[PDB]
Amino acid sequence: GLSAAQRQVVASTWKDIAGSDNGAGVGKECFTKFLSAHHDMAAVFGFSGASDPGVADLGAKVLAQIGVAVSHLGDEGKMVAEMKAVGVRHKGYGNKHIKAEYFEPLGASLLSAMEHRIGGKMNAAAKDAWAAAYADISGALISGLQS
């Protein structure tokens, strides 16, 4: 759960993270750094490696989905219901054995890619609130995945 203050710094910094490309660039960097660090993850996604054209594609779709989750943070039941639906779709994605443990390393890569973009605006308060926001968004996706 996010506090009112955490919801506010997440909604505020998302404007800068989204940039003029709806976070597409942040997505490309997150997924390229993640798969370069964990080569074993390429197969879970069905990618050939970090250079596969699909990582820039999927990176834009993930960041665009985080953007609609950010627009619904004020209604928790709404945000978790729609992230559960995304999670239910993941049962049939990649190697079809996506595991809950894979989400915490992905989170670290996302927060670094966000910081890379926004610089000093991703301060300690922004990082804690985005860590809390990533915990709820992926947590709701995992619930759908395990349903």
- State the residues that interact with ligand [C-]#N by CB under 6 A: 58, 62
Residue 6 or 138 with smaller CB distance to ligand HEM: 138
SS3 content of the chain, % helix, strand, coil (to 5): 80, 0, 20
Q: Tell whether residue 38 is among the known ligand binding residues.
A: no
Report in angstroms how near the CB of residue 67 gets to ligand [C-]#N at its nearest.
14
* Chain CA centroid to CA 110, Å: 6
Report in angstroms how near the CB of residue 15 gets to ligand [C-]#N at its nearest.
23
CB 131 within 8 A of CB 6: no
Q: Which does 74 bind (CB under 5 to 8 A by kind): ligand [C-]#N, ligand HEM, none?
A: none
Q: Judging by beta carbons within 10 Å of its beta carbon (0-12, 13-18, 19+), is residue 86 exposed, middle or buried?
A: middle
Residue 5 or 100 with smaller CB distance to ligand HEM: 100
The two three-digit tokens of residue 58, written as one number = 């999927």
The two three-digit tokens of residue 86, written as one number = 């995304």
Q: Which does 56 bind (CB under 5 to 8 A by kind): ligand HEM, ligand [C-]#N, none?
A: none
Helical ranges in the chain per DSSP H: 4-18, 24-37, 42-45, 53-71, 76-89, 103-118, 124-145
Interface contacts to ligand HEM, rule CB under 6 A: 44-46, 58, 61-62, 65-66, 86, 89-90, 93-94, 98, 102-103, 106, 138, 141
Report in angstroms how near the CB of residue 25 gets to ligand [C-]#N at its nearest.
16
